[PDB]
Amino acid sequence: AQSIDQLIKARGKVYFGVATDQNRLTTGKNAAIIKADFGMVWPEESMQWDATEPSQGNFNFAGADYLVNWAQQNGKLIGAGCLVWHNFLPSWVSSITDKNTLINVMKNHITTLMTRYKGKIRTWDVVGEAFNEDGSLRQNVFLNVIGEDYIPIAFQTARAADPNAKLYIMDYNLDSASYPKTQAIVNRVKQWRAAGVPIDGIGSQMHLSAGQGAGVLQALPLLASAGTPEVSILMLDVAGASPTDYVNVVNACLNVQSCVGITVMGLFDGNFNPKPAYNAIVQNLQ
Ligand SMILES: [Ca+2]
C-alpha cells in the first residue's frame, strides 16, 4: 500500500527512482507503478549519445522529450545521461583524433542536450565509467585525444549549460571500500573539486552478486568522503534479487547524509506484483 519513494522521503532522503523509457511508459501498467512508488525517473537509452546525436549535428529528442514531459506532468524528478562515456558512442566520435575538434564536439553535445532541458533536470550524469578496475583512467577516445582534462572540461561545460542541475560522475564496481577503483575515484574527485571542478555527486551503479550489498555499508561512506554534496545509488542488478543485499544498500544510504536516494534499473515480477526484495525494503524503511 505504501510508496517506497514516500517512505524514503519520510526518512529524510530525496527519492526512490527507476530507469525507464517511452516504450515502457505506454505499455500496460508501467506508468501506474512508477507513479505509485517512485519519485524520480531516468531514461534508460533515450539520452545516450547514439540516441540523441547519432550523426553529428542531427539531434533526435523524440523519446527523451516524451520521458521529460511525462515526468514533469506527473511530478517526478528527472535524471538524465550519460553525456560523456564510451558506451552508446557513435563511431564518428571515436574516429576523431584532433584535440580541439573533439573538445568542440564534446562541448556541442553537452551544451545542446542540457540547454534543451534547462531547469527541468535534477541530475545529469556528465561523465560515465571513466576508471579502469585498477584505478587508472579508462582509455576512451576522450582520454586518448584530449587527455585527462576532458573530465574537468565536461563538468565545466555542463555547469555553464545548466547551473541548476546536479552534475555527477558515475561508475560501476564501487561497492567495496577495498577495491582500487573505489579509492581512486575518491582521490581524483577530491583533486578535481579542489581545482574547482563542479562534480556535485558520485553515482555508484551496482552489479551485485549475492552478499556484495553488505560491502556498500563501508563503500558508500568512503565515496562520500570525496566531499561531493551528493552521492547516489543505481541498482543495475542483484543476483537472485536477494532481499538482504537490497536492505544493506538501503541502510548504507540511510547512514550517509549526502546520499540522496536509490534508483533501480527497470523488485517486481512479470505480472507487476511485488517481490520479496520489495517487501523487505518497505519494512526496512517503515
Ligand atoms: Ca559485482
From Swiss-Prot:
Highest taxon above the source species:
Eukaryota
Which molecular-function annotation in GO is an example for this chain? endo-1,4-beta-xylanase activity
Provide one Gene Ontology biological process annotation: xylan catabolic process
EC number of the protein:
3.2.1.8
Q: What class of enzyme is it?
A: hydrolase
Q: Which family does it belong to?
A: Belongs to the glycosyl hydrolase 10 (cellulase F) family.
Instruction: Provide the protein name.
Output: Endo-1,4-beta-xylanase
